[PDB]
Amino acid sequence: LQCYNCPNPTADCKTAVNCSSDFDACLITKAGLQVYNKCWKFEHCNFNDVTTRLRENELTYYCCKKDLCNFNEQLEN
Numbered sequence: 005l006q007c008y009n010c011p012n013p014t015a016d017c018k019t020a021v022n023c024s025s026d027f028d029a030c031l032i033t034k035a036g037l038q039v040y041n042k043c044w045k046f047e048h049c050n051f052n053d054v055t056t057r058l059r060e061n062e063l064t065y066y067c068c069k070k071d072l073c074n075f076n077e078q079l080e081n
């Protein structure tokens with residue numbers, strides 16, 4: 005999956021790059037402050053496998069399966 009991967013927790017990442025290996029679900033987390041951007045698994049995209057790996061909790065991780073679907077446009081209802 006090709007998604008944007010930033011070196012820091014910014015709220016406007018625009019660097020498109022292929023996702024590392026062992027990654028089939030793009031992840032777009034938003035802890036009301038920083039829009040995390042990283043390649044995540046579809047099995048680890050639950051309400052415990054992400055808030056634990058990042059060592060956080062209050063956040064809305066949204067996994068996707070489209071070349072670049074973790075952008076900042078899928079968490080504003």
Ligand SMILES: *[C@@H]1O[C@H](CO[C@@H]2O[C@@H](C)[C@@H](O)[C@@H](O)[C@@H]2O)[C@@H](O[C@@H]2O[C@H](CO)[C@@H](O)[C@H](O)[C@H]2NC(C)=O)[C@H](O)[C@H]1NC(C)=O
Binds near residue numbers: 006020021022
């Ligand atoms: C992500 O990687 C792809 C590499 O795709 C390869 O080429 C495809 C045509 C297909 O054969 C895949 O199975 C291959 O793995 C990048 O796409 C190519 O990248 C090369 C080198 O950068 C470039 O010369 C080609 O023209 C590109 N072709 C296409 C269709 O993209 C792609 O750009 C990478 N994306 C990012 C954000 O890095």
